[PDB]
Design a protein around this ligand. Structure first.
Ligand SMILES: *SCCC(=O)N1CCC(O)(c2ccc(Cl)c(C(F)(F)F)c2)CC1
Length: 78
């Protein structure tokens, strides 16, 4: 349990999970991507966010390094 974890809400953690999904699929039309397909992307994004949440030593490092991963993915996918 790290000190900075006490100041990060689950709503921020979910928000960054969904930013990772958006980096791969910026137009999440459910006619293009079905229910199980969406759940798979969210499952992978949760592992990526989860690893940063456990390893970061500050709220700034957590947010800015996840933002850097999101932009890296967005570049690779665009
Ligand atoms: S999208 C074209 C690029 C590619 O083959 N990549 C970059 C993105 C991935 O690292 C990836 C794919 C799906 C998800 Cl849900 C994630 C992540 F959000 F990080 F979990 C990453 C796959 C390899």
């Amino acid at each position: 349990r790290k000190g900075w974890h006490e100041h990060v809400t689950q709503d921020l953690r979910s928000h960054l999970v969904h930013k990772l999904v958006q980096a791969i699929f910026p137009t999440p039309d459910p006619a293009a991507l079905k229910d199980r397909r969406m759940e798979n992307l969210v499952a992978y994004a949760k592992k990526v966010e989860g690893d940063m949440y456990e390893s970061a030593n500050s709220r700034d490092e957590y947010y800015h390094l996840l933002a850097e991963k999101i932009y890296k993915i967005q570049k690779e996918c665009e």
